[PDB]
Fold:
Amino acid sequence: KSKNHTNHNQNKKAHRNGIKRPQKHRYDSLKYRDAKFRRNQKFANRGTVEAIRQAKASA
Amino acid sequence: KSSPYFSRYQTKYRRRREGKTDYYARKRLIAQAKNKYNAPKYRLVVRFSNRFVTCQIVSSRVNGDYVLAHAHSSELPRYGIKWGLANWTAAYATGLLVARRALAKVGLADKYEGVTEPEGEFELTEAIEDGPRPFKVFLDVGLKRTSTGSRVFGAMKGASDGGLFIPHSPNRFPGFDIETEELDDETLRKYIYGGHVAEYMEMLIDDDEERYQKQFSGLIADGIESDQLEDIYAEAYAKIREDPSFQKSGKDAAAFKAESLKYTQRKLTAEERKERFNAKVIEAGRA
Amino acid sequence: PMKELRISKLVLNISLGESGDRLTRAAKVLEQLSGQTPVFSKARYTIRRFGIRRNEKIACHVTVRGPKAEEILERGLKVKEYELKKRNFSATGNFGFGIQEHIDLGIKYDPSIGIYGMDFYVVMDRPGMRVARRKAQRGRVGYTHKINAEDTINWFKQKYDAVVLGK
Amino acid sequence: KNKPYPKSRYNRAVPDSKIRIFDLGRKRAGVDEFPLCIHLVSNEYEQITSEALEAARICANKYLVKIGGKDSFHLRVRAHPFHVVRINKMKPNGLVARVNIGQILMSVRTKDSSRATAIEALRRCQYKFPGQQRIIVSKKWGFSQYARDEYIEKRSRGEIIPDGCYAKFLNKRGSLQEKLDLFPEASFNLA
Amino acid sequence: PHSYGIRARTRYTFQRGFREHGQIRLSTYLKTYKVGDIVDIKVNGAVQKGMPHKYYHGKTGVVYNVTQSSVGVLIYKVVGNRYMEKRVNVRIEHVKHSKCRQDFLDRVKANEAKRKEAKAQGKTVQLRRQPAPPATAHFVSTENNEPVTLHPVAYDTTI
RNA sequence: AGCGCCGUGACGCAGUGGAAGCGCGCAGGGCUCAUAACCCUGAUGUCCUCGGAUCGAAACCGAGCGGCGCUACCA
RNA sequence: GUCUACGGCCAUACCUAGGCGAAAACACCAGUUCCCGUCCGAUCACUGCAGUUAAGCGUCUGAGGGCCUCGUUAGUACUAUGGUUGGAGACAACAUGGGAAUCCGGGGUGCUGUAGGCU
RNA sequence: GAACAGAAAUCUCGAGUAGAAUAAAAGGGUAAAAGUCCCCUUGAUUUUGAUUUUCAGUGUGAAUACAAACCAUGAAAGUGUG
RNA sequence: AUUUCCUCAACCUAUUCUCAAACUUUAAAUAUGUAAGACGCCCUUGUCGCUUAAUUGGACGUGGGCCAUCGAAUGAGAGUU
RNA sequence: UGAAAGUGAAUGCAGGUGGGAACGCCCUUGUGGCGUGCACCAUCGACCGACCCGGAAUGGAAGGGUUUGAGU
Structure:
């Protein structure tokens, strides 16, 4: 008879290589954020980079 | 009314049981978008008693409500609006007074002027072309029905003409006559300056004599139609705009501190309760 | 003080029977008797035996609140001979009386136009009932501030001086 | 071993139960009367059937009616069949009662002079039940949760008033006026 | 005969508490959430819009996105031999702050205060936590506390 | 063995919750002489028994007995 | 100190029967011209203080119904782990740990800001 | 309680934590509403990405929170992408 | 005889015996999510077309101060193709 | 790159941020501070094609976008 579902060995198979955690990254993609927030942050970061570069050049 | 019924009974909120707060409308009144973070939503709370009108501007926090500015109709006598402290001009004046107080508190007093000379026109507080936006307050009416002329809009109109930006439409103004969807400026100005009271005066001068004497008391002893109504309403509008500040009087605790606790029914203690129980048992004499 | 019982409302339902095809004529009868729109009533569920019409105006009830409330009560009590049973007085403080073939009521009469029948029901509560009927802060009227059958008996003795039939 | 399977809106067609009467004898006795109680407790988990319950009830009643009279016992059946046992046809089949540890099956309250025959009635009816059972001379006064010495001590003061088979007792709650009007002989000491 | 509906087997999970139905307290709409906050997900049955799945009920995550009426929570769920990132848009009615974050903040503030005091007075730091230490010797006295000798009780039925 | 139906005047056939129908049989009075045919009628039904939901049951729902009938195939 | 105007927690706040409430506020209340809406100015919007604490409201009194809290119940029930433990089994004891509920009894019957008024 | 004449037909006053209703199975939720009534409307509209469930994190179905327009309804806060 | 009688039913009160996988006010044990600073803590400042009545706030930053139990125990080299 | 007609990849050190091999300089022996930073990953941008726009006979140049490509 078919339909022989069981979970006896599934936990052991999962823990053979362990439950791997995903790699943690410092920066996450902004495609998950609000469109207006990302659009404004683009200009805010652009101005921040420009100001920092100007500070390095002038000083 | 059984014991299990009492046990399973769930009481409403305290203010809902008191019939004071509409929580369904309050939730939408104070609910800031989470992406605006701690920007407070300000409500122009307008309430009417049988004699007085209270207008205030409130911001809601987690632990309770906070009042930014307040203006009660029992202050206009200092400006010249004694008698009829719950009329349309009373609501208009206290809305104008609270608008000026809030603008002074936020600093937009000498910069954001509204309508210094009201003329019954539907005018939203426009923003400065290059400057700060006007203070935005949302009208709160409580449980009063929003009929065409319920006087919550009259207080809102006074607050808006005081300089505050209250988003509104002329739908619920005294004279609107919803057939062509057009505001009646003459009726609006008449209600702003108390002309409805004047028309009541004209109709009652000679129609029942005794009714005109018994109704509209108090002011019958001092004033008459067309002598001060439009005039003193305009003058007190100017007086409010000239000096809208609020002051604390010298009526402190003093003797009233000791003349108040005497009439309070105090609670007995456990020992007194036991003594009363024993005394009642002895008085019954069945033990 | 101000705990005096006076008339509050008096609903005039149709006592002669059902409106039926005479619905319009009954409506004018109530209109001429009260001076108000008869506000046609509504049917809740169709009766499989009485043969009523679903969602059709089968009754009309009005009120005569004001000085004319006393006048209409006087006219109703005139045909009723100023005699009501004790059970006519409800425990909540309201009393009603229904009439059939009111010869003493001032309604026109000719070959078919003539006598009708309206059952009156009177509710009386003067003080502090706004605190229970208002949209604002609402409360429950106090127990001592309530109208009982005995109070209605005494008020009907005082006003409309008559005798209650103690059956 | 199965989960309880009672009659409900999901199990409607169930054969009728067998025991209809659960109290036999002088049901309308008094608290002052019958100062002795005998219980037939179960020392193990069982699945007593309604057939056995009614058979033992009949045997106990027919034994009791001719040893002390019909007006001397208040035999009560403390087990009710609430579990439906299903059987594939040769799908409810029968009704049984599930009995836990120390659960009473039959209870008899009599006088101190009828203790021997009260024990004997349950001893004879022990053979009609599957499994093992025990007979216990209850320390309580009849069906009252109080003990005999405690009940008589409180009755001397007057805190207990009989009402039919059971009685009503003084409790430390309720209106004082109603308590006084309902307990006249009770001496409410001020303490 | 398993069914894979969204709210399957949620008969008691989404139930309101006993004598806790009806109006929802308005302090939830006044709570402030920022990106990086640690929040708990507790589904409210009265609010059906923005309802997260039953798996995320009782789960603690990190806020990553903030919208007008809801918030984005990052959760890690087991899908076999690895964790998977789940971004759940949950209305603030089902979101509450984790009190562990406030306890952590208080611990950090206390540590900073002790460190500042130690630097000022030239003393030791002694800031790390310790497990339950072994009991130190005490001086249990006997005056007015004479020991009571106990014996096992005999078997006596109370029925 | 299961499943399905039914149990109604002495007899038989119908019988839908506001409540027992018809015919046969029995018995008389009338034409005629009496029965056959009649005319006039009359009476007779614990609704198989028991219990329950329903304001109320023959009917709705259950337990029992009797009468039966249908499933009753591949090695 | 009392009270008024406006919120949070959402019954130690609800429900019920009685004792009080100086001032003020609130309330009932005095009429339907206007704005407005109904069969009906009772709800609904207005000009008003001639009246009232009588109702609402506040507070107090019930060996009150409920609700909140603490103990008994009780370390009882139950349960994680162990034995080549007992028992035919059902189940039970023991060992290393965790640990209720109902009932009963004792106590209690709301706390909480800003701006202002009252011999 | 009222005539009625069993009928609470209809019309009333009180008690009434929801024991009603919410199209259709069941469960959850809902009381100045999510129920009943009234008014106005077509957010049952166009488009893009992100996310949840079943999942291999493929598809299909269903759903969630946003964004760019045009709107509806409200006095407004707001709500509406069936 | 819209006058009375008890059993005939029915309703209310206080009780009383015994149950629920598709009942529940409560409510474990076991199991389970998150966190245990270095991507950490405070002052001075820069960006934005987002947001706010408002340099108001959100986010990204920058320069200085806090680097001695670097913040529970134990153990361990880890991860990606 | 688009189905195709067609069009066709530098604002900058061929960009910014975080980790990061190797090297160098200071500490002063600490699991060290500073300066660059290959490879690789994550991320914010820029450019090319397609799509959707404003729309400033034939042409789509500056201006854009919540997108899209197996691109620079």
Observations:
- Chain E is about 15% helix and 20% strand.
- The first strand of chain E starts at residue 38 and ends at 41.
